[PDB]
Amino acid sequence: DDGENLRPVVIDGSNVAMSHGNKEVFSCRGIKLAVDWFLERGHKDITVFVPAWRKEQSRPDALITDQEILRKLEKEKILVFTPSRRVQGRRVVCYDDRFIVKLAFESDGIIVSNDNYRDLANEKPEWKKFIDERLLMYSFVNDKFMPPDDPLGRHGPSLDNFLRKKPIV
């Protein structure tokens, strides 16, 4: 009764925020737009990973817009901050790519990102296979989040079936 035939969705928050932000600004609205696109379809299991330091105030070398969105998505049990802290004045950021891939793999889900995570794929063959079969790339056209209807190409599933556990034929 609550989207149990839908795959868990794991979103690369930084990838999406930078993409909506035209690669120069961390645009939190982009994360909201991606999230909302899945909610509108009945997805209940959605996780967005973002490094903790993105909570810090906007600065010239790390511009960010609509930052309050992050706390709101966290309050909705959708966004999860991954670890970061300063050590000897240097920001040390745990690799969130690893959180993204591990969570999607272990929950048998889908990854929303334009990043192909080749370093991680080259680390473990089961992850390479998984990323090959479960990556959902996308385009933004202004505020319009547009995933492809043919996410794995001409010989792959429809987008509708790609997001289901059991496909509909």
Side-chain angles (χ1 to χ4, degrees), residues 112-143:
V112 184
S113 190
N114 287 325
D115 192 337
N116 202 15
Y117 310 107
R118 272 303 149 274
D119 280 350
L120 287 179
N122 289 335
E123 186 177 338
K124 299 176 181 303
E126 59 280 18
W127 283 0
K128 173 175 278 186
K129 190 185 189 299
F130 180 86
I131 296 157
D132 282 355
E133 295 177 7
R134 297 293 186 83
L135 183 70
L136 180 61
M137 295 186 66
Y138 63 87
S139 297
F140 274 107
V141 176
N142 297 314
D143 283 344

Side-chain angles (χ1 to χ4, degrees), residues 51 82-83 92-100 115 117-120 123:
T82 55
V92 177
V93 188
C94 295
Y95 198 39
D96 59 330
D97 290 4
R98 203 163 190 103
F99 280 81
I100 292 155
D115 192 337
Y117 310 107
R118 272 303 149 274
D119 280 350
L120 287 179
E123 186 177 338

Side-chain angles (χ1 to χ4, degrees), residues 11 16 20 30 33-38 112-113 136-147:
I11 298 172
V16 166
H20 183 258
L33 289 165
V35 163
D36 285 351
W37 186 91
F38 291 93
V112 184
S113 190
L136 180 61
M137 295 186 66
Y138 63 87
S139 297
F140 274 107
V141 176
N142 297 314
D143 283 344
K144 183 191 189 89
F145 179 73
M146 286 186 84

Side-chain angles (χ1 to χ4, degrees), residues 29-70 72-86:
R29 282 197 68 250
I31 296 171
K32 174 184 180 65
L33 289 165
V35 163
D36 285 351
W37 186 91
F38 291 93
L39 289 172
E40 185 70 16
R41 296 170 63 97
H43 289 267
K44 298 292 183 287
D45 187 349
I46 305 169
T47 302
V48 180
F49 282 121
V50 172
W53 68 270
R54 286 303 184 171
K55 287 191 275 192
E56 293 172 7
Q57 211 189 346
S58 182
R59 41 177 207 106
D61 291 322
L63 298 169
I64 178 165
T65 51
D66 296 298
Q67 200 175 29
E68 62 284 353
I69 287 181
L70 304 182
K72 179 194 191 283
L73 284 171
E74 187 186 34
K75 190 184 195 308
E76 294 168 358
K77 292 187 180 177
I78 287 167
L79 182 144
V80 174
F81 288 107
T82 55
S84 59
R85 69 182 160 128
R86 284 189 184 261

